[model samples]
Target: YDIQAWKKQCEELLNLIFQCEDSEPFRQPVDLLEYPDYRDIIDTPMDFATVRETLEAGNYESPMELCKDVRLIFSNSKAYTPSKRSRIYSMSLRLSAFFEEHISSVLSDYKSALRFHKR
Candidate 1:
């Protein structure tokens, strides 16, 4: 279940992140690092409320200003490009694996979780 959904969601999310970052929102992120940019690029069945709530919580006056912080890992990974798509589908897989591994630790009496457990 997670394999398929994880690939799909991460690709979609990463793609969305790319769109937001490539736009003016990221170029002038000084004030808007709190909101998501390029809202128009989001996939269908959208949840405007979620986006709105995030913007409101950050005291962001505009979506452009809020999306500034949306592209944090881009610089660290040097994944910047002019295209509106993401280049690291593999990164998504790695992240998904990490998430699964982390979540397993919270499960009851899962032996594998012990490998990553800290004293």
Candidate 2:
């Protein structure tokens, strides 16, 4: 089946993340100068900007792949910031939980909409 609908859905999800107030730290790749060990800790660095680029470029094959990248943005933060009470850690927890809730709704709606698509 064609996947343009899936792409559109993913884009909307990305936009919601981009609009999040606490999303600044995850808007782009971490600056090596600011955190030299970021890459060493986050083997797969993912950010909203990078995800948007990947989505626009048509590089994503499935919604799961997109979700994986989005999840990494949070896991990377949690992995690097050891203290659960730290600001960055808190942001990660809050935003990622926000994402999971919305993504669950989105995926459910997407599946329902898929069934209603034209013949």
Candidate 3:
């Protein structure tokens, strides 16, 4: 149910590889330590924690607000501005899609299971 944690885990896959390379010998683009917050971009869907917090607080007016925040984050990021796509850009899209497609369904299924358990 913790989609935010899953997002971190997904990015960690690349981070782990980056760290492994550093242990031996690092190279350009793969050396994440050189570029701090290398993974912090709108290449993926963002702000799930905000949505969860709003929902938990029971203060949000509508789910559409969550969608708007996600949209706004992507809009603010210049991730799509590149004329020629980089390998990282394409990889980011794949990572984003993986979570976008899978996380929702997983959360929905888990929500049902939680309700059943409560009963």
Candidate 4:
């Protein structure tokens, strides 16, 4: 999908998650065995497991939940990243910058549309 369309979908999913506050929280423990490289670094079992299990189950219901978990993963990874600064850390930062850039553009477009409608 185009960037604009993708953002629209993302917004819709986020709206659904926000509206359905009663959705069951993902509570499974994370199996560090799955991520051998950062097994010791990752401490939030729920956050990691939510992202993994939701994808595995293929019945996604909570965009806000997934978004929070994903952000946690990136933040934790950055926090515990090796002191030497591995390529993994660099890529994670890059991805985050990219995401922020796109998000800014999407919001800017929305603002423009709102102003146009007001006029």
Any runs in candidate 3 off by more than 4 Å, and if so which? 1-33, 36-84
Could you tell me every candidate's TM-score relative to the true structure?
A: 0.23, 0.83, 0.33, 0.43
- Give the count of colliding residue pairs in each prediction: 6, 0, 0, 0
List the global CA lDDT of all models.
Answer: 0.34, 0.82, 0.41, 0.49
Per-residue lDDT of 83-102 in model 3, one digit per residue for the tens?
A: 33654444444444543564
Candidate 4 deviant stretches above 4 angstroms: 1-8, 11-37, 45-63, 104-119
**Residues 7-108, candidate 4, lDDT per residue (tens digit)?**
344455434433432222222343456567555666664443455556456544434344566567557657656653766566556555544544455455
List where candidate 1 sits over 4 angstroms from the true fold: 1-37, 43-86, 109-119
Q: Least accurate stretch of 10 residues (summed lDDT) in model 1?
A: 1-10
Best by TM-score: 2
Instruction: State the lDDT of candidate 1 residue by residue for 1-119, as single tens digits.
Output: 12122223333443454444233222232232332442333222222233334544655443233233332423322333334344443453344344344333223233333434542
Name the runs in model 2 displaced over 4 angstroms: 1-3, 109-119
Instruction: Tell me how far the alpha carbon of residue 56 in candidate 3 is from the true structure, in angstroms, after superposition.
Output: 26
- Backbone clashes in candidate 2 total 0
**How do these models rank on lDDT, best leading?**
2, 4, 3, 1
**Model 4 weakest lDDT span, ten residues long:** 18-27
The local distance difference test score of model 3 is 0.41
Q: Best to worst by TM-score, what's the order?
A: 2, 4, 3, 1
Report per-prediction Cα RMSD to one decimal. Answer: 14.4, 3.0, 9.9, 10.4
